[PDB]
């Protein structure tokens with residue numbers, strides 16, 4: 001069901017290695033709906049190539065646009081299982097401290113802060 005369930009550790013590591021070779025300026029991001037979520041739609045895909053200069057605040061605006069949300073739908077984004085301490089950090093920094101051992105950056109979204 002979830003990305004980590006669908007692909008082996010060996011498979012995830014090799015995909016990250018091919019993104020490094022072919023999209024060297026991009027952060028490989030896995031974005032998933034909270035298994036509890038009722039209100040927000042599911043995304044059209046799971047694996048995202050995010051330009052490494054964008055900060056978390058802009059990435060939240062990107063995903064809100066992808067979901068086609070309006071001004072007063074709530075949207076919370078967990079990185080590596082937890083709240084972002086700051087939305088102003090460049091995703092290249094966030095990656096180095098929050099990356100998985102397979103080399104993806106894992107994010108989860110919901111309409112409640114309580115996931």
Ligand SMILES: CCn1cc(NC(=O)C2CCC2)cn1
Pocket residue numbers: 047048049050051062
């Ligand atoms: C080759 C696959 N690919 C993916 C993108 N863009 C994204 O994933 C979006 C996240 C913000 C831009 C471009 N090419």
Ligand SMILES: [Cl-]
Pocket residue numbers: 022023024025026
């Ligand atoms: Cl690139």
